[PDB]
Amino acid sequence: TKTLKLRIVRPYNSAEVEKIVADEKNNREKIALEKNKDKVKEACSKHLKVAAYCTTQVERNACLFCKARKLDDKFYQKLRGQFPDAVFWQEISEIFRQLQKQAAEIYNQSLIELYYEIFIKGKGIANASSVEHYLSDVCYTRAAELFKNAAIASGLRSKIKSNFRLKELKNMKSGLPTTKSDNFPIPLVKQKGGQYTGFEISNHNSDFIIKIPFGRWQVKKEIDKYRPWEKFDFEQVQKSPKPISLLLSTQRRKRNKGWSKDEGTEAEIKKVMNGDYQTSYIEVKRGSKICEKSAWMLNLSIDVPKIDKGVDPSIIGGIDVGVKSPLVCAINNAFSRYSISDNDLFHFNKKMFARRRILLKKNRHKRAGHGAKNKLKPITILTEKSERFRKKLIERWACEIADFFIKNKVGTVQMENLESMKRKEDSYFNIRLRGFWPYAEMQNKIEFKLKQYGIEIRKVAPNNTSKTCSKCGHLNNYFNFEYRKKNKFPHFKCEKCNFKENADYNAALNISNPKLKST
Amino acid sequence: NTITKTLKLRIVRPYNSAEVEKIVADEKNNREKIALEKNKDKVKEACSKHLKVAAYCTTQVERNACLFCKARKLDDKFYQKLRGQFPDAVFWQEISEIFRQLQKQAAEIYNQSLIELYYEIFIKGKGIANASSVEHYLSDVCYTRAAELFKNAAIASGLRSKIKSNFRLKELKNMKSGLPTTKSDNFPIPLVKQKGGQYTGFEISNHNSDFIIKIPFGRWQVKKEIDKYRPWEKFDFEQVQKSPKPISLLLSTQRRKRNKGWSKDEGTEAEIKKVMNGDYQTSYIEVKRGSKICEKSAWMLNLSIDVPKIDKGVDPSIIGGIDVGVKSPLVCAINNAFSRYSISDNDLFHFNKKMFARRRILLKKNRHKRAGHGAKNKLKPITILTEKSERFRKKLIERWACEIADFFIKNKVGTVQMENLESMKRKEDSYFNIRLRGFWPYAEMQNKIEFKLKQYGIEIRKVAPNNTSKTCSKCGHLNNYFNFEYRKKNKFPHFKCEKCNFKENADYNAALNISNPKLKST
RNA sequence: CCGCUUCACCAAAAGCUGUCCCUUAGGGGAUAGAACUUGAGUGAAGGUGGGCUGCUUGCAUCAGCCUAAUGUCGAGAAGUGCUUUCUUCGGAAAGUAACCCUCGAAACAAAUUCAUUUAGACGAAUGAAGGAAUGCAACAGUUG
Ligand SMILES: [Zn+2]
Ligand SMILES: [Zn+2]
Ligand SMILES: [Zn+2]
Ligand SMILES: [Zn+2]
């Protein structure tokens, strides 16, 4: 099962109507061009670099040109009068808010009525069959006769059946969590197996076209003063449907910043469109980020069974020591990296050193009579307990690396060899931690943890890492470690590739290189 | 006309009687005399409170290296003797399990009454319910249920007043918010008794320079069924009028007497002093638990009080304004007398940055840090440091608010003008929102500054907030060039007018706009 | 050690200027200048550099105490997941114990009990009942 977040700029009614939209958008754009001959000098971005005569590019957010490209609902209303089946952005966003508040009201009121029905009249003793009877006989009919698409009512039946828990609240340990109606989409479920193909998603220019079936939604004569939204009907699909199709824009915003694309999900959407990857859920709500809380995205939810893979020796991992981290892990194929935390061990050594230097100043003439026997008594118990802490921390690190590789499904990791490891000046060790460390138990515990998950070890031990780039083995021999402390450990810039890289990840990439062999 | 407040104080012990308390006070005096003549000057640590009355020694100590005060401490076998001697007397363990049962039952009845009233308003009533219907259904359901379980009327009227002050009807009418429901066991019992004119409330008695409150209560009895599923439901709570047993508590004040402000008229010690002196009749009594300290939680107590407003020289002809700054957190601006206030002395954030580094290194990889023992323990260090940092933040905010109020009383402004909240979250010239991503809650800050200016009768006017960082203040010349990235790339300079050459602090302009009275409110 | 503080000295990847291109939505790359700044750089000094209790809280100091504590564990089985059995729509029951599964566990000091090798000290406890600093600054709170 998965949840996949895509965006929408506009509906897609037909071909020629959105053609007319683009054409008259460009027509107002060229009217803004030919009118602004030093009437404004903001030089909207794009508009200046394409064909214009303006002075200064301003940041493309408060300039006059895109407001002209921002179309008007007078023109949209005249378009609606030529073509009544050409619906637009405000119409679909009103329908979004209307269905969202509809489902939120029906959901919350049916929850509280179920809770009351079970626990105060019937005294808390019934079955879940009565819950399903309330579902089918009350809220299925309510959502199917408030809007005549019964599949949405079945999806709400599924949603409330998941969201209402009888046996939890039987002990009254908590309460029913209610929303502020900004956290609530609409189900729009179809069948999983075969017959209901699912939302008829097609391809477009690096983007998609959805098809969501509906009815007629006659705009009512009485637009209610108390109720600012409910004026539609959403008539029967079995009598007279009219499926709304929308343009699914693939722009994923990165935390209120510009337009970006993430491509770990586009292949999954293509797998939906070929015929496999049988999704059944289109959640329609706002985004959870800044300024996407007003623009309506879409959420495709999918289900796949647990198809296990295991590990394979084609994937070849690497484990290297770090300078900010005590260790790092790297895979030669994908990005797929992993740091190891430092701060807990750092604060622990800080407290241990502070305790030691406290005890080494309030003892020097204070505990008399014994000599340095009972002066040395409390530091030893500290050191056994510190050693047990270091052992448990190393076991936690080994289990973390094992979980990392098992999620990444790596068959074998090439781990850098031990005597070569300890004789390294670039490590996090031998800089602050001088030499006081049990390296061999760490290696043996890592190997035992990995072989518990069944992953072999290689001992490849190259001649010179930490300055050879993974893209091209230039052997950038100006990376002296003295130079690195002289530049306070800067990035690794492979100058022949113009390859600026986090300075230790490439060192971990050299250990994952399978072309060099073991020892 | 009046401003509400609460006072949080700690319960020391259940004050029992006059005779039994005379017995225990004389027993403390007896132990003091016994260890007075037991020590034939094997001691030189007579504490300061003892050198005046019994001094055969050398020096003074810090009132914890004493022995006579240590002799005043009472054991627990003598309390078992007092348990056997007086079965009518009350003691901590019984009162604590009473209050735990009361917290559990009050939370359950509060949840059941909230969903009951939501049902009888919106489901069966089809949403057809004005506010008078809601009060009618409050009195119809919640008071009847609470008097059906608790034979007290005080707890019943308290639950009705608490649910009335919690069921915010208009937001759940137009679907604007979420239905409340509690989760925590730290749920305070409301305890309302009225106070208007021919009634007083709870009988505050200053017996011997201390504080004794008197909660009316019935004669509880021991249960018979003790089910294994729910342990704490183990009492009966019989009727006040058939069998009154007033639980009377003692609240600590010895720490408050040693403050700088105790012989004054404005610090909260003077409100406690007037509560001792008859007036400031309380009405609303919360019984919380404090920090979990040493296997036995110290139950706090909250005392409502309707203080009259301090006059303190108010004349709303004078007008001042405040902002959010970039060098100071808050800057205050006087319209005409050219007076400015700022606060630019604290080292608070390396502290909150070490905790946030610790939270992030716990949070982002929680998978093996402390697993196998629930999620209440898995976030246990985080909860202690978040509560302590929010307490530090609230106390710094209240110190800021008192400095602001002292400034405005020093410059005699009768009414202050403050920004709209919907703009304050979206105001990126702030000293906040650039150092801090999602940390600070500003609604509580504004509530504290609103209350602290209300404490001198200075009113707070919501204003038109639009583009205040660039509109000038000496003359309204509308210098709309002073953009955000323009401000960053000029190294955060002075704002200067295009034609006044008004080179002054930009945030000080951003409040001297609001300090000019010509802005209409909203 | 210190990604602790102060002082002094020192280096510039990160920030600015300026240049140039590419879409210029997000911004991406390099070359010369300065130190506001930075530094997990150097030297002198001191300093829990984590907490707990001290009677509502915070900072600083002080008295005593805990710390492997960002740790490690105790008990369970309300819930999540998983196995088996049934109606086979949909859930139940038995477990299992992996779980952002549930409840918990360190911290002033008098005094008391029981026990320990020989009145000293340790252990297990006991557990509220004004036994507790100084100085500044405040001190409506819950719920949503
Ligand atoms: Zn523009
Ligand atoms: Zn390379
Ligand atoms: Zn004394
Ligand atoms: Zn101006």
Numbering used by the authors:
A (entry chain B): 7 to 525
B (entry chain A): 4 to 525
Direct quotes from the study:
Cas12f, also known as Cas14, is an exceptionally small type V-F CRISPR–Cas nuclease that is roughly half the size of comparable nucleases of this type. An asymmetric Cas12f dimer is bound to one sgRNA for recognition and cleavage of dsDNA substrate with a T-rich PAM sequence.
To understand the mechanism of Cas12f activation by target DNA, we determined the cryo-EM structure of Cas12f-sgRNA binary complex at 3.9 Å. The 5′ end seed sequence was also observed in other Cas12 nucleases, including Cas12a, Cas12b and Cas12i. The most significant conformational changes happen in the C-terminal half of Cas12f.1 (RuvC, REC2 and Nuc) and N-terminal half of Cas12f.2 (REC1 and WED); both move outward upon the formation of the crRNA-target DNA heteroduplex between them. However, almost no conformational changes are observed in the RuvC domain of Cas12f.2, further suggesting that Cas12f.2 is not responsible for substrate cleavage.
